[PDB]
């Protein structure tokens, strides 16, 4: 998964 805390 992407993850809930990934940002960009």
């Amino acid at each position, epitope marked *: *998964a*992407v*993850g*809930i*805390g*990934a940002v*960009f």
Partner: antibody
Amino acid sequence: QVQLQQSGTELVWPGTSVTLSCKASGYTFTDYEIHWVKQTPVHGLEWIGAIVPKTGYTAYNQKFRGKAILTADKSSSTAYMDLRRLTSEDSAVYYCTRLRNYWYFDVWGTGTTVTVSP
Amino acid sequence: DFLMAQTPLSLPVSLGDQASISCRSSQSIVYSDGNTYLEWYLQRPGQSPKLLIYKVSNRFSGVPDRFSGSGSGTDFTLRISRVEAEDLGIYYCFQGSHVPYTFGGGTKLEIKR
């Protein structure tokens, strides 16, 4: 050994609350998110929510909002899930699993059985 | 809301035959980096779920080459070219692009007679 060590079977009375623990071992706890999954015969697998140990940030499946509370303890490398006001619908096997951003659930705990009964 | 419709619910097969499991998303699950985070897990009786495929087509290390996956957009398929006794269990697709993440309803792979 890279592992997630889950707490033992919970036999609990209806209306009570319970704390489930997921202890990370053999890797860096704060490098991965912790995700919780509920498993039942009727609903299959359900994504409960997740926590980011580094920031304490959480996200929930709205169906579990108010039912589940996720925390992460950096110093003990342990993730916790409180399940609140238990009913028979909460009887299930609960898994924790880890996630590095953009990868996948490679390592899973062996699951905690929760049995709700008076 | 990025629900996964997984079919069929149960798939009776003979060992050695081919198996095909399908998962359809209500809307596109392509993530903003261009990747689609669509995974397939297997859960056998008494065991934890186990990762098979990630990013629609990629085999997790150790997974036999009998397993493959394909699709794009809203339509995804897991294929087992030849089913073996160790493959029996419940397969779940999993949508990891958009929160809340969601599982398909499961496909129980069983022996036909």
